[PDB]
Amino acid sequence: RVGLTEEQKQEIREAFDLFDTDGSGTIDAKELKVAMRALGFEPKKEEIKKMISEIDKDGSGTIDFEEFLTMMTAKMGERDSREEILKAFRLFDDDNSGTITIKDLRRVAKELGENLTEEELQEMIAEADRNDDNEIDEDEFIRIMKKTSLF
Amino acid sequence: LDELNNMMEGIIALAQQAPRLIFMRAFTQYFEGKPSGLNPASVIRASPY
Amino acid sequence: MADEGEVSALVCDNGSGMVKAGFAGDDAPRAVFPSIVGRPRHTGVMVGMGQKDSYVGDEAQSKRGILTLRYPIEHGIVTNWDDMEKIWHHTFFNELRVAPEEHPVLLTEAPLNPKANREKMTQIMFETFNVPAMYVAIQAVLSLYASGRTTGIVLDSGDGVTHTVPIYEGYALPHAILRLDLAGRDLTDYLMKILMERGYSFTTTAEREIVRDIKEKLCYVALDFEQEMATALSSSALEKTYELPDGQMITIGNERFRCPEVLFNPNMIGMEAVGIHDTTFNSIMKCDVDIRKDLYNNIVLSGGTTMFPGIADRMSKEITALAPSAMKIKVVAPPERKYSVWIGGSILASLSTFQQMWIAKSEYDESGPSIVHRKCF
Amino acid sequence: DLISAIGFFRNYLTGRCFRRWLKAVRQKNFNKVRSKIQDSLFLAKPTFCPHLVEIFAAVDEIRNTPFASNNQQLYLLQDYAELQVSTREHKAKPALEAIVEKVQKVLERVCREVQKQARLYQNFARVMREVTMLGAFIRLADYLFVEGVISRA
């Protein structure tokens, strides 16, 4: 259950607005598919139809901001999937070397609107790494993904 | 004044000569004889109030 | 407890200027809010502004200017208990938003607190909110609990409270604990006043908070107050001017370190109470002489006042100048030095064996609020 | 294209998974701190906590001991003498002996339990630790009691 801060509320409000200047307002299934295409999931018809059907409080289809926001709040709190996990690890890597350093973890934190400290980075390295190399390669990263997906 | 002193002396004395735990047969041997700490009348009169 | 096998304790850091309420097992208290009780200034002037019994916390700071901000807790000692019942009412229904009877209550008390203070919480809490169990802990004891220690002095200092609390083998010695109202509130009030000295407007509650945060970042304690007088007067490096986006370019010279030095030279603001280093030194000397070896060598800093850069060095040297040189001085200022009260409270409440120490509802109904004495330490 | 470089959509899984890693490390930090202080406290030990609560309930007799006739009665010098002596001793010395007896009984029970379990001998280290800090428990209880006596006087 991922709650939305002010940063993400503003970003999602602007994103929902990014669909309709024509005044319709009620964004659609294909536009939500475009939203998770920007999110880099594996967007197929089943996800679109099932999620919109189960979040439509009456069967609107052309989802408004309220139920759209509720649906994406449910999606964020829901379980992740491996193909976009790998795509997002490529996002993680600044050089696509498959590794994360102390400074790489710091910049990853700051990408989120979350400014952090060094002690956090050393403790992350010591915990999730097997030789404290400041290089979180593929197997270490997938290992920490298992540990943090077994919540 | 001296009888007030006598009654306060009774207060302090009966707060002081209770049989302390650190004196009995089954508890001194757990430490090395007499432990260090606080004495009833000592702290009673150390509190300036 | 912390999980839901036995319901998690309502861990509430009842500070002097900031109250942190939450649940055990967590590290960040879910209800972080100041220790003020805002009440409506009037009735016929704020129609539509949400008249209530009392605004609480950030809601107490919602109308931060046009509310009768009544202080329940001043320097640790709680001045009114109808405030807490309104604090609690806004806690379990507007801050934690969970029915109080669901979970036991954990409250933090300033050391050297009179008996009627604790009993009134027990009296009010059961009659209005009717929890089935709770337990009231000490602010400094939980601060040591977050620091991972159970033996040694705790210097917990919120907004106004400051208690040097020597603890041996788990017991805080009330004969030795020294009360001190000198804390960051007085220092911020000094920084409030000494910004007049450079010609910069600071008189409102909005300016009260801006200066407070400035103190928490910039006001670093002077390790040896004499040379900072020399450097600030022989150079402009300490005569720094800090920018605020509100349109007030404020200059502080020796003013920077003068604000936090009062913890060690109280006499500049007129305060004649012994400084926190002297308060620590005198307090431990009230204990047994031998246990002072690890008491002076356990100094842990906690509370809102402890958001002070460069504090550990001044703590150790001043205590070293007071305490015997051979006797060790372990001044510790962990990053939890503001959340230590709640973190340790969550840590203590998360103990599995700690799940029979709570006072049952029937126990209060029979023995009254004095049931705390039957389960105090 | 408009939604391709939005900050939150670029950061969606990066932030969510990195935050999962972050919170996992925070919670294990909390776990180790909690454990390494839990093995530093009397409350954790099941041999120590319940008898400690019993001591809490039993010591409350110190508070109810008037060491003198704390009344403004119309005494004489001698009348003051006998009534103040009576309230000094006859209604206090029994309380002293009773509290001494109950404390010695409770601590003897604790010591006998731990030492007989040691003679009978994971939990082995815990029992050995309790046997070791028997003395610390006794001393702390005694200092609590002396503090109470000082406050009462």
Curated annotation (Swiss-Prot), chain A:
Ca(2+) 1 binds at D20, D22, S24, T26, E31. Residues 7-42, 43-78, 80-115, 116-151 form the EF-hand domain. Ca(2+) 4 binds at D129, N131, D133, E135, E140. InterPro entries: CALM/Myosin/TropC-like, EF-hand-dom_pair, EF_Hand_1_Ca_BS, EF_hand_dom. Ca(2+) 2 binds at D56, D58, S60, T62, E67. It comes from the Eukaryota. CDD domains: EFh. GO terms for molecular function: calcium ion binding; dynein heavy chain binding. Keywords: Calcium, Cell cycle, Cell division, Metal-binding, Mitosis, Repeat. GO terms for biological process: cell division. Ca(2+) 3 binds at D93, D95, S97, T99, D104. The keyword Metal-binding applies. PROSITE patterns: EF_HAND_1, EF_HAND_2. One of its GO terms (cellular component) is inner dynein arm. Binds four moles of calcium per mole of protein. This calcium-binding protein is found in the basal body complexes (the functional homolog of the centrosome in animal cell). In mitotic cells it is specifically associated with the poles of the mitotic spindles at the sites of the duplicated basal body complexes. Belongs to the centrin family. This is Caltractin. It comes from Chlamydomonas reinhardtii. The lineage of its organism: Eukaryota, Viridiplantae, Chlorophyta, core chlorophytes, Chlorophyceae.
UniProtKB/Swiss-Prot annotation, chain C:
It is an enzyme of class 3 (hydrolase). CDD domains: ASKHA_NBD_actin. Its main location: cytoplasm. Belongs to the actin family. Its EC number is 3.6.4.-. This is Actin. Actins are highly conserved proteins that are involved in various types of cell motility and are ubiquitously expressed in all eukaryotic cells. One of its GO terms (cellular component) is inner dynein arm. It comes from the Eukaryota. Keywords: ATP-binding, Cytoplasm, Cytoskeleton, Hydrolase, Nucleotide-binding. It is found in: Cytoplasm, Cytoskeleton. It catalyses: ATP + H2O = ADP + phosphate + H(+). PROSITE patterns: ACTINS_1, ACTINS_2, ACTINS_ACT_LIKE. Transmembrane segments: none annotated. SUPFAM superfamilies: Actin-like ATPase domain (SSF53067). Pfam families: Actin. One of its GO terms (molecular function) is hydrolase activity.
